[PDB]
């Protein structure tokens, strides 16, 4: 039988002596694996980005959870955060000053941009990869998420869900001020609230092959758009995709909110009580919970 590979990637760094992170990793990976199902010839590839101490922590967790109940073939791959950092930096350097905490261009911020240049980092054999946060809880078989790649329209390179707080209403304030009629930062269904990076379907082939996407990576394009939008962030990849998502929504296949149901309400209590609901509303059968800003996930 012809073997078929599925690729997931998760960030797992600074995990040693960090019980809160290990608990999240535990919640994410246990649900993922309990609920995952794959055909006989299919193999699930789990890529972890870690320094050496966190690699040992992840292994100890992983042996406790593998092999999976459903008995499918599962391969674990680790990538050195320091190796990836150096590979990302030339590509990613110029965007750091706009999207990193705070100023300006530090090596330690580079990895938070991994997804934007993932097609240049992963071997060309990998055509697609799903990057996932470790503060998730899977409520369905992750194999089902992969079929969303099929719903990508011509020219789209990334599958991503909307940001469910008005953080981007706040971020785009000055652009909003200068453009009263803009949908930039407005809530759904007609506004553009920006994106959340918790679940991202990164089509590496479409990313490599897009003339538009490649141009938006160039220092002067990053700079031009950040100026047009008066954009300052500290959320990295999320902030970059959000920004280019305002200029060029064609590039993104918007996932339904149930694929990344965020639970953080921090912005509700910081000046957005009125409009919060319009952003935060998500209805339908939840597929993935995202316990962002350390928000406990319900059981």
């Amino acid at each position: 039988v012809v073997p078929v590979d599925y690729h997931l990637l998760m960030m797992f760094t600074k995990a040693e002596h960090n019980a809160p992170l290990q608990a999240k990793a535990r919640v994410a990976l246990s649900s993922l694996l309990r609920l995952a199902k794959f055909e006989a010839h299919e193999v699930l590839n789990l890529h972890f980005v870690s320094e050496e101490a966190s690699r040992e922590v992840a292994k100890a967790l992983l042996r406790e959870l593998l092999p999976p109940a459903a008995g499918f073939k599962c391969k674990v791959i680790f990538h050195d955060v320091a190796v990836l950092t150096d590979k990302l930096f030339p590509v990613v350097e110029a965007m750091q000053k706009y999207f990193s905490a705070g100023s300006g261009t530090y090596y330690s911020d580079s990895i938070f941009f991994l997804s934007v240049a993932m097609h240049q980092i992963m071997p060309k054999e990998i055509p697609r990869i799903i990057q996932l946060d470790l503060d998730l809880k899977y409520k369905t078989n992750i194999r089902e998420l992969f079929e969303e790649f099929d719903n990508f329209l011509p020219g789209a390179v990334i599958g991503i869900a909307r940001e469910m707080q008005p953080v981007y209403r706040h971020t785009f304030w000055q652009f909003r001020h200068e453009n009263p009629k803009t949908r930039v930062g407005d809530p759904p269904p007609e506004g553009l609230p920006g994106f959340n990076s918790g679940v991202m379907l990164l089509n590496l082939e479409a990313m490599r092959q897009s003339p538009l996407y490649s141009h938006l990576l160039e220092p002067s394009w990053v700079q031009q758009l950040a100026d047009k939008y008066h954009f300052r962030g500290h959320l990295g990849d999320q902030d970059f995709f959000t920004m280019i998502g305002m200029e060029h929504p064609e590039l993104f296949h918007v996932l339904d909110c149930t694929w990344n149901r965020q639970l953080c309400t921090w912005w509700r209590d910081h000046g957005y009580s009125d409009v919060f609901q319009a952003y935060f509303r998500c209805e339908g059968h939840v597929k993935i919970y995202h316990g962002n800003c350390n928000t406990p996930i319900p059981e």
Binding site: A101, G102, S103, V167, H170, T171, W173, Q174, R232, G233, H234, L235, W266, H270, G271, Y272, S273
Partner: protein, 35 residues
């Protein structure tokens, strides 16, 4: 990481070194929009 700047102006992190004013979202006052 940093804590988000509750101010509408300046950098993304609160206590942006290059900021002196703090324009708060409606309903809030203070150097960090506390009350």
């Amino acid at each position: 990481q940093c804590e988000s700047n509750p101010c509408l102006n300046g950098g993304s992190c609160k206590d942006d070194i290059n900021s002196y004013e703090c324009w708060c979202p409606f309903g809030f006052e203070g150097k960090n929009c506390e009350l």
